[PDB]
Write a protein that binds this ligand. Structure first.
Ligand code: 4LU
Ligand code: 4LU
Ligand code: 4LU
Ligand code: 4LU
Ligand code: 4LU
Ligand code: 4LU
Ligand code: 4LU
Ligand code: 4LU
Lengths: 207, 207, 207, 207, 207, 207, 207, 207
């Protein structure tokens, strides 16, 4: 298997809940283990923008998402926002890649400054200290200089700043096809197989 | 009339030709004068991603776009890539706002370093020196640190870095509704009226 | 197989065409796929410094190099300087490592600033954004502070700055042995096997 | 086998000789090849803080450590402080990971500035230029700003700054259990198996 | 009496609760007044790593610690996390020295950025603005560049960054002797007498 | 007694041996304890510029200086350049102030970068980490930017950069009176009484 | 003739009037033309520290100094502090080297920031813009970080920061011999012959 | 005569002893005086890579090199690594240009930080403070960011960073012709005549 066995998927309070759910579903189909974290603001976004009725408490959430994705028994683990007993809270945990999708500008700030105010922020702090993959998927416009400084600092440290900025070069027909572009880019970054976005120019031999 | 009378609209070689055409059409409907500039790479993008058959030479382009948008006689001016006789090449020109949509990472670089290799890049250099509005609409993912440094430098100088990162909070039903989100944000930035994206919370009085 | 399956090999206009041709030949012998890019200035260098008569147009070049190296059918792909349909132009391409050998100071600048003026520069921009290997092989002396700043910026982002500065510690007898030192260092960087430069001290057990 | 085949283990003159000896012993048990380097000041520390009577000259040291650890024939190589014929002195050597444990503040300085005054410092300079793993294990308190600047510079370049700051969350009963915490973190960093420190939260499924 | 009359002792959520309790006990024995602050995460650490059953609410905590240490009547003051009426919340308070032991990376961040989210963070902000002693005792490994930048900024402003990195040069026999090394260094920093760690070389006259 | 009880006085290889000997003599007269360190290059300077025949080995040096200054029994301690058992090598030592007089540009460099190559450099590293007084007395001209950067870094951290730049405003009659100006400034910095340089304007009441 | 034909010699309000007068005298003996500028504070220093009774108004000063030095008719030109008609006020003047000896910390500041408050400061601003030699001779101790930053900035731009820090390695017998050391260094910097300070090691052939 | 009368030629421990010997020989043929300095590591390089049997002690070395080059009586002066009586140790020496060829990365570091650990490093420190020519000829690959930062700092101060990166544009036939390219560039930098590398384009009048 190419790519990581385990992904920590954190959803925070930016627009774009559909990207995080689609990623969750793709990861499950590629038989990966997912450690799923969601902020209170992200729960309000998912309520506002989607018709996914996600239960509030972690065990009910775990059961709902397991059904939603067709996941195996304990393939998706759900941890609450202060559960310091969860693997992402410590660098002594087994290695996983982390993706924050969508990543609010407030979460981006916390990760860039080291704030650790909750498990998502601590998980990212641990990813950086242990040199484990960290992918941030902001969805904001305009980006202010505050945002850009925080992204630059993190990029220079080896985090991947992957904005929710879909391309249009594979004839998208629906909102879902734009969602799938961004998700495909995340999986490419992680080294996980995907077949939603072809390899550019792969059959072009010369000219 | 709120907002600028004249906009220089530059399209460069990033994915997202639909955003630039939609903006062009909205500007025309708001009775603004548009000084339209398009790079060779952007012409290849518009060919690849859209079914708009845009003529190559500036007078034919001007006629095509005038028809496409329903514009008035000489409402859209089209200038080629080395036409230094055009108003955007000099700061002694009448003031206009400039938008580069989509803005390639190569154009972003040129604007951040001052390269002036063609009329688009020179136009942006002039906008910055004259303190006229400059909005850049990049479409790239991931953003590398090269990109982020260039965006930060320009943001700190007062350019608006407005990524093609649509929101999902107004129940988008189509690819067009995502395009219209980004276009609405550009027009809001410019102070030009738009009715594609409601004013958030405008009827919320308390709680 | 250790090391990458596919290498993008870009030759630009610094002295040292022999290094790029030797690398091309070694990569072919290690059964790798090569996406070969050459600038106009590099073509004038190869004419000035070598007796390799390299055809100008990409399909003739592809045939010439395939013969020169003994490569397999479509093992070497050749792309022209504005061929945006080629795999290196997009990060949605299959992953490859990129080497720019020789790397002119003008190309070094473009990569450090993000200029993207042609396919070589765009390919490097993509390597950096996707965190794929990027090795730059400058050949210049003196290095000015302009050069050194650009190299530092790129090194700090994880590019490998590998000057064409051969060592003399393996009893070189010819110009070719100096060329092979530098090529061996490139292949070591990439993780590709080579037997031109022994492993230093490999049989020294103690003292 | 996960992790590197060969480790360069350098011991320098900070308190904490026990960490370096314990690491040496763990590496040997995981059947790795160790290129062992020790400074004169580190030899005085090991004399002051431990009851290990380590011979001064490299072949006697090699024999002593081989016995101490139960190592195989030439599993541990010992090189003196100016032995430029040893593999760590050149980047043309076979790849290994390097750990400096303990790392004195003087060694940290030398690595951050590039001083190369002896084989340890040169070995680290080579690790950085070749992008091979480099882990520094300082033991100092307070850290001054001199120290912190040097650590930051090296961390930003991809070295791992791993202070000898044991945790207490696995019920340590002895000085040895604290030593083993730090050693476990080094081996985790290197990707080498260890069973001294459990994976945090590995059996926690939800809450 | 040498050293400060009053210490604000803040315990935050890093491993190493034993260091903070030992310091508390030493300060009490040196007849100092202690303003004790503890975060919720630190309370969970003390529960996880020690057999100290510390009551949750501040008056019960005050009574427990007073008994635990043998302190005098109101020698230990305990303030909750939002008690802005407490002396540490204002610079108009009587001067005290502040120690944060252990100091989580999240607390380090807050102090370096000025976040003031609770009384501990505000107390540190006040120490810095009033130029009163501030000692931070982090316990983390590896230190990432995020951490190191925050430590450097604070060190450059005159805070003392004192990692929980015990030395081994006074023949430690137990976990307690390592704890006492770090505590002795804190008291030395503060100018408070201690007899757990001898003065190095104090009887060495020459050589 | 005002000022420190114990001074570490390090002499390094810049011109100006007379300043260090004069300071040594003044410190002895003010009944302070002196921990005296001298580099090999400083010994060659004292031979070149003075008629002081200073013995090479530390106990003979100690006896010579004790006689030269009229010091009490073990008032002057002399430590050699690698004597890590001496108090200045550790921050667990009793507090003293440190003066490096004269301070070579090489010593200034080592202190600014943290090099610790000998006891003098380590002593300074310890002074900085423990926030103990550190006064550097360079004697060089011109100062290059290398020198000035190193001085600035150290000044910003709270070291006192006190060049051997005597004033002429107290009617100096001899080389000795210029030496005494600089020595008086060092003692003023340390808070040690001196009567060689009057207090400027002390009897001026008004105008 | 080696070295410049014309020197602008500015004396400002630091201690060390003797250095400026000695330099003036040496320049006159080497048949150079001197454009002499003196601040009001420097006039008060020369009154306080020397027995030179220097007239206040520029023509009387010119006559006095001409006599004092044995200069030729109009060899010394004297300009007042706001005489913008004097050659040093403009870069269109004939080239000369400039020395500010002594250079007050206030003058150093003005030159580093560009303040131009009087002819001395403007003259230095002109030297820097025209890339003409500028030598600053500060006499201050300690140097604060304010001072050091200003010196560094100017050194990095190519000014020579030459502190009044005499050496003792040519057996000085008097205050005058220390003055002559510093003056010799200034003349060496300027490329003007001097015989007060021998060429170090000039007769040493080997060892 | 164009160029300097006297060159300090320092050889340090990088590969490329042939460049330093060739330069030495060219300087001697141009009747310059050479102050030759060689490090211990450079002596081991010259033994490893060449068949030059260079005696260890400075007078024997002086005699050997004088014969090797055909130099005049005392045309080559040889100084050992701590000979502070030699002209390069002081800025009061007669002016010479300095070249460090090859320049190890350790020597580059020392020169950039001001370390002065031996006569070579001190000589370079003096060249920089006196604004005398300093040319560094590194031979390393890859260059790490440590190296590049040190080169940049020195380049910005006016040192010439001239890598041992030969060009191929004058039809080199042998290893010697590559050596001569680099040597020709050094002599061009110094302003010393050479006829090994023609003046590019000197007979091209137009096109
Ligand atoms: C609830 C809420 C918060 C939005 C938000 C919306 C809602 C419903 C939308 C969907 C209506 C409109 C867009 N929003 C954005 C957003 N932050 C951001 O970076 N990008 C967003 O696109 N925010 C703000 C963000 O949630 C906050 O600043 C939270 O404090 C983030 O906290 P978190 O990082 O712990 O999730
Ligand atoms: C033609 C071409 C160029 C793409 C491109 C594509 C094509 C068709 C797509 C649509 C197939 C895939 C995505 N592309 C992107 C892109 N540059 C960029 O910043 N973002 C893009 O989304 N580029 C590269 C960009 O066009 C170049 O680097 C040009 O040199 C930009 O030149 P310009 O700034 O003058 O327009
Ligand atoms: C054609 C040409 C260009 C040389 C050159 C030569 C020629 C024949 C030589 C071989 C005669 C002499 C040395 N050259 C160097 C060089 N640039 C550089 O960094 N190092 C070189 O060694 N250049 C300049 C370089 O080619 C330019 O600045 C181009 O604009 C680079 O464009 P490119 O990056 O797209 O290839
Ligand atoms: C010998 C000696 C040197 C100690 C030392 C001790 C001794 C016995 C102890 C064990 C008694 C007390 C603590 N020490 C520390 C230390 N340097 C440091 O960063 N942390 C330490 O914990 N040092 C100083 C350090 O050894 C020096 O500054 C050397 O010059 C380092 O040289 P090295 O990097 O080549 O080993
Ligand atoms: C509860 C909890 C939190 C640990 C923790 C542990 C637990 C039990 C351990 C003991 C099991 C494992 C190690 N931990 C560390 C830690 N933070 C840190 O900098 N170093 C630590 O050593 N953390 C995380 C830290 O508590 C958080 O990031 C909190 O948000 C800090 O909040 P605070 O600054 O207000 O106390
Ligand atoms: C021996 C020697 C070294 C001089 C020196 C002299 C001699 C006799 C003099 C007295 C003849 C001329 C002036 N010297 C100066 C000097 N370094 C410096 O910063 N300022 C000086 O004034 N140096 C160089 C300095 O000694 C070195 O660079 C040593 O490596 C410093 O080593 P140290 O810091 O361990 O003492
Ligand atoms: C008059 C006066 C001013 C001294 C001074 C003295 C006097 C007599 C002395 C001789 C008694 C004591 C030392 N002084 C120094 C000094 N400034 C300085 O950088 N170094 C000095 O050595 N100053 C201060 C300096 O003169 C001021 O700050 C002026 O504003 C400088 O103005 P200027 O640059 O235009 O000359
Ligand atoms: C002896 C030795 C040292 C090599 C070396 C070799 C040997 C024989 C070779 C020839 C086998 C392989 C390449 N080497 C290089 C090298 N340093 C460097 O910057 N570039 C080199 O090309 N080094 C390391 C360098 O010598 C050290 O780091 C010394 O401490 C430098 O000390 P120095 O600056 O005083 O000469």
């Amino acid at each position: 298997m190419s790519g990581p066995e385990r992904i920590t998927l954190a959803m925070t309070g930016a627009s774009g809940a559909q990207y995080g759910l689609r990623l969750l579903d793709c990861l499950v189909q590629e038989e990966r283990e997912v450690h799923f974290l969601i902020s209170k603001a992200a729960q309000l976004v998912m309520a506002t923008e989607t018709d996914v009725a996600l239960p509030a408490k972690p065990q009910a959430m775990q059961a709902f998402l397991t059904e939603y994705c067709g996941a195996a028994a304990g393939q998706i683990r759900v941890f609450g926002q202060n559960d310091w007993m969860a693997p992402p809270a410590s660098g002594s945990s087994a290695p996983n890649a982390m993706v924050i999708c969508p990543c609010s500008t407030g979460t981006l700030s916390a990760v860039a400054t080291g704030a650790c105010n909750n498990l998502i922020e601590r998980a990212a702090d641990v990813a950086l200290k242990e040199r484990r993959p960290l992918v941030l998927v902001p969805r904001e416009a305009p980006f202010s200089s505050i945002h850009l400084e925080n992204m630059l600092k993190l990029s220079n440290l080896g985090a991947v700043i992957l904005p929710a900025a879909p391309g249009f070069y594979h004839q998208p027909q629906s909102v879902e096809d734009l969602v799938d572009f961004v998700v495909a880019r995340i999986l490419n970054t992680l080294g996980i197989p995907q077949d939603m976005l072809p390899r550019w120019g792969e059959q072009h031999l010369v000219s």
